[model samples]
Target: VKVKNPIVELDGDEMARVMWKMIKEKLILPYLDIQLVYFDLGIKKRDETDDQITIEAAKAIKKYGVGVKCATITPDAERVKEYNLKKAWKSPNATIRAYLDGTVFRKPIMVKNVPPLVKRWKKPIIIGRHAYGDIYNAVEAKVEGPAEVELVVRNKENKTLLVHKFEGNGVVMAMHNLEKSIRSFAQSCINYAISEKVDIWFATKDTISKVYHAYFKDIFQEEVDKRKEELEKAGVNYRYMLIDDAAAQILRSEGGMLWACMNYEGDIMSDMIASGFGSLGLMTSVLVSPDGVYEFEAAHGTVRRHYYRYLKGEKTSTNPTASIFAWTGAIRKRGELDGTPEVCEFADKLEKAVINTIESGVITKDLQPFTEPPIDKYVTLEEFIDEVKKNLEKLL
Candidate 1:
């Protein structure tokens, strides 16, 4: 299959980088004649380029319309010393997300033999996260003396309200959101839900925050209302819940809906959902801008522990399922955009090959304990990819 358009490929760090090459060599390149717009977003490259590469990659993704990325390191103080570079750089993911102005959606890949931690979950619960504002962009202060914390707006209305009276050694924080960002988030979630053919469960605590939380609820409601007829025709439902209520219901119900969450809520719940489904390595993430651009990546990290072991010349069974799916997601989306069914079918076949390999009992060490029928044998990283490639060959 020949891909019609070039897909942006953002390479990254460590064990994931090692597996990324294997996946491209074995699974992707052999099957398709494609042009990949490449960018090295590895930490060292990012540092050397002063993070300009990440910005360029995001622009390329927007222009080409699809990108697939490997997990990269977001350096800390320790990483700065290890790499012996300049100051710690910001997360490449965050930089890309900001540049693209996209909403992130994460969904677990459900393997039949590997059951979810939650017993009733039979399907994947996709989370559409609003990755803007809220606590992530809040202002915080520690009060040492008596002071009046007031909320004020500089708009024409000239609204002012007393937030709290702070005594000695107290904490205060203020958060805000733009109408533009809120609407974009809602539209993105609604669009994703409709595409996935799943119900939208948007949750927020509007009762307590009043203006703050209610604004989010209202925007989502308005957006969903606009799509009500279309949603009904598509047999999709849209429901709103208080955040706590939604959390409780998620545990009790069978999974198979898109849970739309605010910034902070999404951050917390996505991790919970990833672990609940299986392993973080089994989850897939895609960032979708409101206007239709897409960037796909694994939800897991760089597998630093496994990378250390690999550096010692030891073969580690680091799972690459999510990373593989990221490539397929980008491929399929590219195919869709280009109106190429063959490319899309190739993506599907490749995905089926991965799942079939797992279900057929050849899996990495991570899945050994969770796999059904009791597995005593687990393959190394290279061996796992080889097994998947063999199955992919049969499918092809």
Candidate 2:
């Protein structure tokens, strides 16, 4: 039987762009003989093209079904001045997500030694946040006096389904979510949970904003109901709770589940998870579409400072574990979709090598402190990659 490859690789700017070449040359190219459709999303090029590169990359990923991306800086004022960017561009992730009609899912790379702020997170917690609507991308207006705020929803038939008027003096914010978008988000979460065979938990404050929150809950439950047979067959469970209760439970629980959150809630919760998981370097992000299109990238950014030091002929320690896992995840899922056992097994082996390398004494500076002092030795990027390569070769 012929095997099919499923990932299209997207290259990005900054330090990660440099690291991308090293990773591919040292690790991926030496092992895998797979087709990679590449797109250059370099800062200068993106600016010159007004981020057309990013849009093209998204479209390619949509067509190819999977993408592995390198970290690109979402240019700020300093970056704009430094790089002389033509015009400010919004986050490529956000832009690509909008085009893909996908939800960004972030999961912390849990290590045993690092202590999380939420102490009970023994397992990885996957957070799927609806990227479309809600406060992260909402308009707000502050009313000084008692004024009426109204929300009207109309159907295609020009029928007003609901009209809500709020009378309050404190503050008022209007947020909207299209049924199409919410349904897609719900489907993506369900598909992810089902694929991973993990318990899924959703949180919202239905008690407070019944209409808004309840809409999400209803959509999620609707998806769950639709996938009941598949979920039952996979031995997966779905649950929902109030936001406050969910937060408390997350901190107290031992983990091993997926948490589907609203946009703002996810933005806050993902940070908490990242801090609790020790460092951003250990987090992996994957964007999932309702149609099973997936894109993988490191949750963190290019360690530009460390890269600059490395460029100056100075020894700099930066962990590439998460980025490596990004490839592994993309490959593994691609293999699953392509029905190629060899590709899947290779990805698994490579990931295991990474985990085992960390388990061994060798680590980077960021991870060194988390390990037993004196015993854990901080190694350079090349040294760490060499160590992983040695382990991976053994499996091969």
Candidate 3:
């Protein structure tokens, strides 16, 4: 399968970086004639370029409309020392999400042999977290002794709009969001659910955070109202429930809908969903920009511990399901954009091959700790991809 359009490739760090190369060489390039607009987003390159490479990568994704990213290191104090980075670089994901005005949609991949911990969920439960604003852009401060904190609001007119005083000797944190950004996320989630013919459920602590969270409720309701006729025609439903109730509701019911989450809540709940469905390696994620661009990647980390083992020439069985899926997803999107149905079919073949391989008991070590009755057989990472390639070849 040959691609008609280019897909931006943002390479990354740790063990996943090593696997990223192998994945492209073994699974991607051999199968598809692809044009990758490559950018080295590894910590070393990022530091050398003063992070300009990340910006360039983001611009390329915007231009080309598709990107496949390997999980990257959000260098901290520890990572700075680990790699001798010039400084702690900002999160690459955060930078791209900002550049593209994107919402991250994540879901678990379930297979016949690998049952969900929430076994009742026969299908996937998808989540779209407003990947921006709220706590992620908060202005916070610790209370120094008995200092009073006042939240002052001012309009563009330079006149004071409102001011509220908080009790002294307490922590103070303020978060802000624009109406446009909120509505953009809401519109994307609603449109995505309708397009997929899936129901949409949104939760927020509007009862307690009343005005703050209510901003989302109101804007999202407006978007829902605008799309009501279309959504209804597509057999999709939308609702806003309290956050606490929504959490309880998720575990109690079968999974198949989209949960539109607030920024901070999504950060926490996404993990809950990943753990419940199975291993983090089984999780897949896509970032959908308001402008119709997309970026795909595994939801798991770089598997640093496993990478060190690989460095020592020891076999590592890090799961590659999500990584392979990332490849499939980007190719599928590429196919759609370029009017190449063959590439789309190849993506499907790749996915089915993965599932079939897992079902045949050619499992990886990470899945062993979570599987019922446990998996006695585990293949090395290279072996696993090789097995997938064989199965994929059979399908082709």
Candidate 4:
């Protein structure tokens, strides 16, 4: 298949990057003739460009309307030293999300052989995480004793919004969210729910964080109200609950709903949902911007341990399911946009090939403990991809 449009391919670090190369070479490149507008977002490259490369990549995604990203390192103090020279850069995911103003939707890649940890969750619980603002971009301060803390709003009048009297040592934090970002978050969730034909369960701590959290609650309702008839016609139910109630309800109820979460809540819950379903490697994630651009990536991290093992010439049984799906997700979306049905079909076949491999009991070590009846053997990362390729060829 010849893809008509360009796809922004943002490469990254560690084992994921290693697998990304093979997946592109063995699986993707062999199957289709396409243009990949590549950006090297590996840690060193990010540092070399002063992280400008990430920004350029985001813009490329905007221009092309689709991107597939590899898992990258969000540098910490230790990572900064390990890489040598340059301060810890901001997370590439965060930067891209900020630029695109997107919401992240993470759904588990359910396989027949692997049962969910939460037995009741038969269907996928899609987490639509609001990707902008809150603690992720908050300004924080460590205050000494006997200090007066006041919230200041800078304007022509220079009004002091709120004041807190501090008797002892304490910490102060100020965070913000954009109306546009919140609105985008609301609309993105609603659109995803409508498209997937699922209900929406949006929650926030409105009772406690009355002003801040309540703002998000109001905006989501407003968006839902605007699309009431459309939602009704689509058979989508939109419900708002307190964060605590939603947390408990999620555990109690069977899955199959889009759970819209605030920034921090989403950050924590996506992992919970992923683990509950199976391995984090079994989850697929995508960032859907308000403007309709899409960026697909694995829900897991860089697999640093596996990468280290690979560096020592050791074969590691790393799971590349999510990474593989990231490619398929972007390719499928690209196919949809370019009016190429073959490309979409190819994506589906590739996905099916991966699933077929796993169900046939040729999976990675990560899934070994999770699978029932204890499979005696598991394939290495490279071997797993090769197995998937053979299955894909049969399908083709």
Best-fitting candidate, scored by lDDT: 4
TM-score of each: 0.95, 0.91, 0.92, 0.91
Worst 10 residues of 1 by lDDT: 187-196
Instruction: Give the candidates in order of lDDT, highest first.
Output: 4, 1, 3, 2
Alpha carbon lDDT of each predicted model = 0.90, 0.82, 0.87, 0.91
lDDT of 1: 0.90
- The TM-score leader among the candidates is 1
Q: What is the lDDT of residue 155 in candidate 2?
A: 78
Where does model 4 exceed 4 Å of error? 137-174
Better of 2 and 3 by lDDT: 3
For model 2, the superposed segments whose C-alpha errors exceed 4 Å read 1-3, 113-119, 144-170, 372-376
lDDT of 2 by residue, 103-201 (tens): 888887765555555656778888888767787567777665545655555676553332334455566566677788889998999878888888989
Ranking by TM-score: 1, 3, 4, 2
**For each candidate, C-alpha RMSD in Å?**
1.7, 3.1, 2.4, 2.4
Q: Which residue pairs come into collision in candidate 4?
A: none
| TM-score pick, better of 1 and 3 | 1
In candidate 1, position 257 carries an lDDT of 96
Report the lDDT of model 3 for residue 148.
53
